[PDB]
Amino acid sequence: IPLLTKKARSVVRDLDPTNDLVFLRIQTKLNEIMVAPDDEFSLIVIQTKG
Amino acid sequence: TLRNKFNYNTRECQTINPSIRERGVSTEPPPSDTICGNITQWEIFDAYY
């Protein structure tokens, strides 16, 4: 998960350098993945779609 | 009797020759290393910033 977020952060970063990732949410067919990224720590929560 | 010390003079002449020598020399080019560099707009901006 962190490798995807780092790659995802760069994708957001390429379009605007000043803009920095605040929150990223990936929704799979059977599950929803939410990752909150900070320099000190990263919080990842997996919640099944209702 | 005809040959005389004054009549015939013998001189020995030689040419200086450098002594032959055997030497082995090995040359090997400077060590080369593999370098991988990835450049992104944000990374360039961060250094610039």
Side-chain angles (χ1 to χ4, degrees):
Chain A
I1 301 199
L3 300 184
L4 270 59
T5 66
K6 192 177 181 181
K7 174 52 185 170
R9 169 178 298 174
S10 74
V11 176
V12 63
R13 276 296 223 143
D14 294 352
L15 308 189
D16 192 339
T18 82
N19 174 355
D20 184 1
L21 258 204
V22 177
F23 181 91
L24 177 63
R25 152 155 32 180
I26 292 178
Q27 170 179 155
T28 83
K29 171 156 300 185
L30 281 183
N31 287 312
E32 265 205 338
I33 303 177
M34 292 177 72
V35 172
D38 195 4
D39 48 13
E40 280 188 320
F41 292 92
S42 303
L43 198 171
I44 301 155
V45 167
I46 284 195
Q47 176 163 183
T48 174
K49 163 180 51 58
Chain B
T1 299
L2 177 166
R3 294 186 181 181
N4 296 308
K5 201 69 174 184
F6 41 109
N7 178 11
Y8 274 123
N9 193 336
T10 53
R11 298 171 173 177
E12 36 213 16
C13 164
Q14 86 168 185
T15 62
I16 315 175
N17 289 160
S19 313
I20 74 75
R21 189 77 65 88
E22 54 189 14
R23 193 182 198 86
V25 174
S26 63
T27 58
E28 292 177 350
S32 300
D33 289 314
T34 169
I35 193 180
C36 302
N38 60 338
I39 200 57
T40 55
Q41 197 63 3
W42 60 271
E43 188 168 354
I44 294 178
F45 177 89
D46 183 348
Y48 197 81
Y49 187 100

